Structure formats: C-alpha cells, structure tokens
Design a binder for this molecule. Structure first.
Ligand code: UC4
Lengths: 536, 415
C-alpha cells in the first residue's frame, strides 16, 4: 500500500517489442510454474491481446537448488525508460563510519517485488511464456511491481524505503540505518537488549508495509565484507589477500596480480610492482607465459611476507581531531595516513608517481594535500589538520612567489625525512662577477639538423651540430652546455620562450629528459641568473 | 498568479552534481531547507525528477546566520530570454554606491508549476551514509535570472515613491542585488539608503563603492641613473611585447645598444637617439589606446595575474589587447596566508565593478588550478551571483608588463 512513482518513456520512444526467444517444453513448464506463483503473490498479472509490447523471458538453473528459475531481459525497456536521478554511487567509506555497540543487517531481499509499479508504465513490462515449439499463443503477463533488472527499480526501491523509514528514524534519533541494495544496516549505542528489541520493532514496522524480512538461515553476522574490509562494530580489519604460488604466469596472471598488489599498496606499507610491471614489456598475447626473473620472483616473495601482516583499523569518533601525515616516498610519490590518536589509523593510502609535463615538489605536495582534503570532506565533512615534511619557511618562500595561486590548509611541520625543499632558486638579479653566456640554438625543423652554442663576455665559445633534433631542443641544449661549461655562478641569456617558462615556474621535474638535465645542472650551480630577451 | 516560463528551444534541465560540503554547511542547509519547506517555499521531490543543481552555504556578513546559495549558472543559461533594465550610464559617475540583497522578495511569488522540476537541488550526507535530501522550488528562486525579471513590475512599483522623493539618486537591480548611487556625502548618503531600506522593509526585505575614484592607470617605465645590459634587455622585451597594443612604440635604437657580448651587469651609455626613443614611448604609454568601445553583443572578459606579495592585476576586455579597464588588487587584511581567499575576493570585486559599469559579469581567466579553486572558493564567496570562469596558465610577459602599472605618489590619503 505504497504510493507509486510517476514513470515515463524517455523522450517519446515506444515500449520494447522484442520477440520471445524459443524455449523447450521443459524450460516452459518451469516458467509456467514460477509465473503462476508470482501471479498469485500479486507481483505480476496475466494480460491479453491488448498489448504490443514485449520482453524476452529466459529459464536458467542456479546452484542453490539447481531449481529452474527465470530471467527477463529488460535491456530494451531500460534503454527506453526515462532517466532518474543517480542512485547512491558514493558509498560510505569504513574510515568514515562511527563505532557502534551493535550493528545488524536486515535483508529486504525481494523487496524489489514488494514495491508497486506505476500502473501506467506496467504495459511496457509485458513478456511471454512460449508454447511447445511455437504452437498457438503462449502465456502473456506484465509486472505490477519493481522488476529485477529493470532500470527504475533501484532508485525507486531506495526512495520508497526512505519514506517508510522517515517515521521510525524521527522516533529514535539514536538509531542509524544504512541502505544499500536490499540491505538495511542498523547500528546503535543502546544496550543489546534495547537494540535487539528496536530491531524487532523496526522489522514489525516493515511488516506493516508488506516488507517481509529475514529467516534465521539467511541471517548475516559480523564482521561484514565491505570490499576489501572486514568490519566488526569495535573496529575494521583488512581482508587477508592471497597471492597464488605457481610455476606458470600468463600476462593476464601478471596484470590481475599487479592489480591486486596495487590495491594493497594503499593499505600495506612497502608493496612494489616495478619488476612485475617489467614483465609486461613487449607482450604478444594475454595467454602468453612470461617467466619471472630473479628480481621478479624476489619482490613477489617480499610481498607475500608483508601481506601476511594483520592490518587492523579504527572508526571515526567526532569528538577527536582528524590528522593527516604525509611522506614523499621518492620523487612524485606520496604516502599519507589519517589517524585521530597515534598509530590508530582510520585510512591510509598513497598517490601514484604523477608523470606530468613539468612541476616541482612543493606543487606536488600541494596537489597531494588537496586530493586528501577532498577525500576528507567526503569522508568526514572536515579537513584534517596537516603534518607536512616541509619547513614553513620553504612553504612561505615558494608559495609567496609562485605564478599560480595555491594554498595549504592549517598545517604543521613534522621532520620525517626525506623533507621536501627547493632544489635551487634562480637569482633575483644578474650576478656581478660571474661569467655571461649568450646562448643560441637553431635547427631546421624539416631536416632536423641543428647547431647550438654560446659566446661569453669572457671569450669562451662553442657550437655543436645536432642531427634528429628540433629547434626547441637546440635552444635548450645551448643552455645545457652553458651550465656545463660554466663555474658555480652563471648568467645566461636566451630568447627561448620556454626558458621564460622555466624562469617563472622553476620546475624541478619535467617530461623532457633534456630539461631534467638542465635542472640537474641548475641544482648544481651555486648561483644561476636566467634572463630572457626577445628573439631576432 | 504564475507566468508560464520555459526552456530555450531544445534545451533540457541541468543535471549538475552536488559537490561535497562541510558538516557545518550541511547542518545549516538542512535547517534552512526544513524551514522553507514548512513555509511552503520548497517541497521534497521524487526520483522521477532526474535534474539537479549544486547548492552551498555562505556567510551573511556580521552574522553567524548562514545564507543559502544555489548555483543557477546552468539553469540561467538554459532559461528562455525575456527579450532586465537598461544600464544607467550615470551610475559609474556617482561618488558612492551601496549594494543590497533584495533576493528575499522572490519567495512571495510562485514559480510556474511546469518549471519547478528544473529547480531540483540536493543536500549531501557525510560519507554518503544517507541519501541526498531532494527538493524543488515552488516559488521564485534566488540567483536565478528569471526571478528579478518576473519580479520587475512589483519591483519598480514599490520603488518609484523613493526614486521621486530622491531623483538625484540612481538605483540598479542585478540579480538579487540593488546598487544605489548618489552624490550625497557619506552620512546623508547612508541615512538616505537606510531610509530606502525602511521603505523596503514595509514589504519584506533586509558594500560601499566609489566609482568616480576608479582611475584609469598607465604604464610607467623605469628610470635610472645608469642602465645595465640586463636592465635594457628586460626593458626591450617588455616594450617589444607592448608593441602589440601601441604599434608606435620602438626599440630599434635600444637594440643597437645591445650589440655586443658583454657582461649583463656592465653599464651602457645612452645615445641621445635611444634616449629620444624612450621619451617617445613614455608619451605613447601616457594614455590608453584609441578606438576601444564596449560591445553589448559581445562577451565581457576578465583576466587576472598573480603578481605576488598579496598583489594581483586584471584587465577587462572583449578583444585581446583592447582593454576596457585595467587595475590592481591588494589582499584584504586577514587574507595574508591564503591565496584562494585573495583571489575569490578579487573576482568578486572585479565582478561588482563590471556590473556597476556595463551591467553584467565578465568571464574569468583564472591563474589557478581547477581543483584548487573548486575545493575552496565557496568558503570565501559572498556575492549572490556567481560569474563564469576558466582556469589558465599566465604568460610571463603579460604579468611583467602590467607589473609596470603606475601607483600613487603616497596613496589615497585617508588622513
Ligand atoms: C553502525 C552503523 C553505522 C556506522 O556509522 N558504523 C558502522 C560500523 C560497523 C559496521 Cl559493520 C557498519 C555497517 O553498517 O556496515 C556497512 C559498512 C555496510 C557501520 S551507519 C549505518 C548503521 O550502522
């Protein structure tokens, strides 16, 4: 006795009119059975000639009873049904959930078939039970409830539940109820009796709305499997992931493997797949067998060891601080872990080596910080205070002079090397004393032949011919050599627009090996003053 | 009654995702929403309504009271045209203007029933433990373009009485705002404004600008006792860029002084030929380029460059290099360690002026990353409206150039 939701077709399309797949007397007789039952449960209704629509029904036998079941292919109807608002695609994250005295899962199983269908739309869900090898008219029906597999069902079922629960929720604020699929997750801080009692009350409530609830056999018990996690109301634990030991590894095996590993990389500290990834180089087929190198076999062994460690975790307590600590795990990689109380982590994780075109550490730290911040706001609706491996002075000096706006929330320094710092700093003004290198590189973009060189105020000069180069490259190489052949302090002038970029950005990493080199040289100099001048 | 509003031919309603919000924020929005629902202004809605518009909470200055704000930017763009008021050019020539949020009156008017679905918005739950709290508007929504429009008749109506009582003052309505400009001195001004509010309060309603002070500022070239190889070098690059605006600018003579591979720090003696060339340039620069007029049928643009030390620069224009106005912005007391804040503050300040001058919002080119902006801009926003924006990479020269803008001798002496 629940209010139907108004459902419409697309844009003015038409209900599906796909023909009924031919089945056997056997498959038919089964569907005939199940459908008479459904007919009586009130879920479906026998119709007649007044309906041009149709969806193919199928007959499959599952494992649980090997008993003949049924399936209706709504694909077409779905592609013809109007759009609804996105169903919950953002699921809760264990680190964000709060600890409870108890938690119970109730199974509103075929509740899909409990909610009434918008009487109008019903004709579109019509299907047909075939006759023995296409004899006269097979049996015709239509759904009167939310069909398993139908597009609207999910969002609808969810809403329906939401109204029905509004009352109960309002009555007992101190009771939290999570909806997911056909599962209700109710937890509390009440005494188990009170709790179990309330569970019952809630159940009964459902019962009022025709919502049939569990049989002790199907009853799920804690902990709970929430994708990679085992959750006990007291705390969570990461499911023990297994790496199979074999003597034959296909590319698939290596990819899938690398995958699983990667996932663990977020939780378990120490994971590495470098040598594994290496095995993928030049692969010709998925079913291809690639023998593991010694190094491959090695890291695989080290990993098995780490993975046999029990990673246990803590839930969110709104009365305590949210803290986030980061580590620069090599260049371009960052590790973080959020805990309220030392060593008791809610969530941890690391962000991959973002191979970009050109940046620096501080920027990278920043981007990690933001990624984290965002996650936090979704998880706890609060940003964590930050503990960063960079001096506040480094921060101040970099940010206050960078061309692009950036910011790091309330943070604090924690000396946990390696610390991030500025690899160099181009001079503010030209250096008095130091030599000057008027550099220049020119290449024919079509013959890809070029030359690069310099002339200094001191007399030094040089040129280098290059084959299979580009003008950009030359200009840079000019600068490269300039740094190479210069002492600790260098004044270099150039008309390369890109160098102007380097003056403004002062990146300490780039997609270009060449640039990188220059950076290395830069970092090496005691002082460097870049000056740009218009070309020609 | 309700006037039949529609969507532009072939347009569908927005379906914009709700960005995650802060707890503080979600609490206030809920509070707010329940109230409005009770007041009948908004209703909870079903899943058969697939549209959506982002929402968020901002701070009503001087109060702890959080103000609800919706991002109608998409809806506005999808809403049919009503073929607003013509911009009173006189406004910009007023000694002091003040703004007022008159968006509150909209609730009073009902929204065409057939349009309400398109007003669909959502309240998110932390860790998405709860589904979103869906609602739709039953009345005139704030920040939507159609509102000030439908509300025009009534608006003008209630207004006249004051306008005639004080015809020396100009009133302009943009979205939920009202900007009042007069030539009265501060006190007599604000007293008269409050007199206006009282007037507005007997129905149900509720910044200190100074447009005439908005000086058009020039580019000042460096002057030195002696000039070095580098000094000149920088100078030449700047003017060479500068030539795209004033083609009369010339660096030939100077470029001859740059003949020779010498020490950057070495001093070069200026030839009279080069020296004249410089004065000729100073003369050109002394004034804004000719032939620049605002096109009402063209998108207004605003670019900004981070100058550092809390300083920034902007250029509103419609055609590259053809600037309608240029200016600078210094960070407001308190924003010392926050870039985003200073930025949002500026975007707002610029936008206000843009409205004040041409009666529309520019489209921003922001020297900031998308992710940085999106994650923290709302935290410091204060305007009822939200301008359009794009994120860019600042060309080093453009920055270098405008960094040359002239500043006061001492400043605006606030004795
Ligand atoms: C107990 C509780 C909530 C919670 O914050 N913690 C919490 C703690 C432990 C569990 Cl197992 C769950 C739970 O419902 O499992 C999810 C992961 C499927 C929730 S919100 C919904 C109601 O129940």
């Amino acid at each position: 006795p629940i209010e139907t939701v108004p459902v419409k077709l697309k844009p003015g399309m038409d209900g599906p009119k796909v023909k009924q797949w031919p089945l056997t007397e056997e498959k038919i007789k089964a569907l005939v059975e199940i459908c008479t039952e459904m007919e009586k449960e009130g879920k479906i209704s026998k119709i007649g000639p007044e309906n041009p629509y149709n969806t193919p029904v199928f007959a499959i036998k599952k494992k649980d009873s090997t008993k003949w079941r049924k399936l209706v292919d709504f694909r077409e109807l779905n592609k013809r049904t109007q759009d609804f608002w996105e169903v919950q695609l953002g699921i809760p994250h264990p680190a964000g959930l709060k600890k409870k005295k108890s938690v119970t899962v109730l199974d509103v199983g075929d509740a899909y078939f409990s909610v009434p269908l918008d009487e109008d739309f019903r004709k579109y869900t019509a299907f047909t039970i075939p006759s023995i090898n296409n004899e006269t008219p097979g049996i015709r029906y239509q759904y009167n409830v939310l069909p398993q597999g139908w597009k609207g069902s999910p969002a609808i079922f969810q809403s329906s539940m939401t109204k029905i629960l509004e009352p109960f929720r309002k009555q007992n604020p101190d009771i939290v109820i999570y909806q997911y699929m056909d599962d209700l997750y109710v937890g509390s801080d009440l005494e188990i009796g009170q709790h179990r009692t309330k569970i019952e009350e809630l159940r009964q409530h459902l019962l009022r709305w025709g919502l049939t609830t569990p049989d002790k056999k199907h009853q799920k018990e804690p902990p709970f499997l929430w994708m990679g996690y085992e959750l006990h109301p007291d705390k969570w634990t990461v499911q023990p992931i297994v790496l199979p030991e074999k003597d034959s590894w296909t590319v698939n095996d290596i990819q899938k493997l690398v995958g699983k590993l990667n996932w663990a990389s977020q939780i378990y500290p120490g994971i590495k797949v470098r040598q594994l990834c290496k095995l993928l180089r030049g692969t010709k087929a998925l079913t291809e067998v690639i023998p593991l190198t010694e190094e491959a076999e090695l890291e695989l062994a080290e990993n098995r060891e780490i993975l046999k460690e029990p990673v246990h975790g803590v839930y969110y307590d709104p009365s305590k601080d949210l803290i986030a600590e980061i580590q620069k795990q090599g260049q371009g990689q960052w590790t973080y872990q959020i805990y309220q109380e030392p060593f008791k982590n809610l969530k941890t994780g690391k962000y991959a080596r973002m191979r970009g075109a050109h940046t620096n550490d501080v920027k990278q730290l920043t981007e990690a910080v933001q990624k984290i911040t965002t996650e936090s706001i979704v998880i706890w609706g609060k940003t964590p205070k930050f503990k960063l491996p960079i001096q506040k002075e480094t921060w101040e000096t970099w940010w206050t002079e960078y061309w692009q706006a950036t910011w790091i929330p309330e943070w604090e320094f924690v000396n946990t090397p390696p610390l991030v710092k500025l690899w160099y700093q181009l001079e503010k003004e030209p250096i008095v004393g130091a030599e000057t290198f008027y550099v220049d590189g020119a290449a024919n973009r079509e013959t890809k032949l070029g030359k690069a060189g310099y002339v200094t105020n001191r007399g030094r000069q040089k040129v280098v011919t290059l084959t299979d180069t580009t003008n950009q490259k030359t200009e840079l190489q000019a600068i490269y050599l300039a740094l190479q052949d210069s002492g600790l302090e260098v004044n270099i002038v150039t008309d390369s627009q890109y160098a102007l970029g380097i003056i403004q950005a002062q990146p300490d990493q780039s997609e270009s090996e060449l640039v990188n080199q220059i950076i290395e040289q830069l970092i090496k100099k005691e002082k460097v003053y870049l000056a740009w001048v218009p070309a020609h | 009654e309700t006037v039949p509003v529609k969507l532009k031919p072939g347009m569908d309603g927005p379906k914009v995702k709700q960005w995650p919000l802060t707890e503080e924020k979600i609490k206030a929005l809920v509070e707010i929403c329940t109230e409005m629902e009770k007041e009948g202004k908004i209703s909870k809605i079903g899943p058969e309504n697939p549209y959506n518009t982002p929402v968020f909470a901002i701070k009503k200055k001087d109060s702890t009271k959080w103000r609800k704000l919706v991002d109608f930017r998409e809806l506005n763009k999808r809403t049919q045209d009503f073929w607003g008021i013509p911009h009173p050019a006189g406004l910009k020539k007023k000694k002091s203007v003040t703004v007022l949020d008159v968006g509150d009156a909209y609730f009073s008017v009902p929204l065409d029933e057939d349009f309400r679905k398109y007003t669909a918005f959502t309240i998110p739950s932390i860790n998405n433990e709860t589904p979103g709290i869906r609602y739709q508007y039953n009345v005139l929504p704030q920040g939507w373009k159609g509102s000030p429009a439908i509300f025009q008749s009534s608006m003008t109506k209630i207004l006249e009485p004051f306008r005639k009582q004080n015809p020396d003052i100009v009133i302009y309505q943009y979205m939920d705002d009202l900007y009042v400009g007069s030539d009265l001195e501060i006190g007599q001004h604000r007293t008269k404004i409050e007199e206006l509010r009282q007037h507005l309060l007997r129905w149900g309603l509720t910044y200190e600008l100074h447009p005439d002070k908005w000086t058009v500022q020039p580019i000042v070239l460096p002057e030195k006792d002696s000039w070095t190889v580098n000094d000149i070098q920088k100078l030449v690059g700047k003017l060479n860029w500068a030539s795209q605006i004033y083609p009369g600018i010339k660096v030939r003579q100077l470029c001859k002084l740059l003949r020779g591979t010498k020490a950057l720090t070495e001093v070069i003696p200026l030839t009279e030929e080069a020296e004249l060339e410089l004065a000729e340039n100073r003369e050109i620069l002394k004034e804004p380029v000719h032939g620049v007029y605002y096109d009402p049928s063209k998108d207004l643009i605003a670019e900004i460059q981070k100058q550092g030390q809390g300083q920034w620069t902007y250029q509103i224009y419609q055609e590259p290099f053809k600037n309608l106005k240029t200016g600078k912005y210094a960070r407001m007391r308190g924003a010392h360690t926050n870039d985003v804040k200073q930025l949002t503050e500026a975007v707002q300040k610029i936008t206000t002026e843009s409205i004040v001058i041409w009666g529309k919002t520019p489209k921003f080119k922001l020297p900031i990353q998308k992710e940085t902006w999106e994650t923290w801009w709302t935290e410091y926003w204060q305007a009822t409206w939200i301008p359009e924006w794009e994120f860019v990479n600042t060309p080093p020269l453009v920055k270098l150039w405008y960094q040359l803008e002239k500043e006061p001798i001492v400043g605006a002496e606030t004795f």
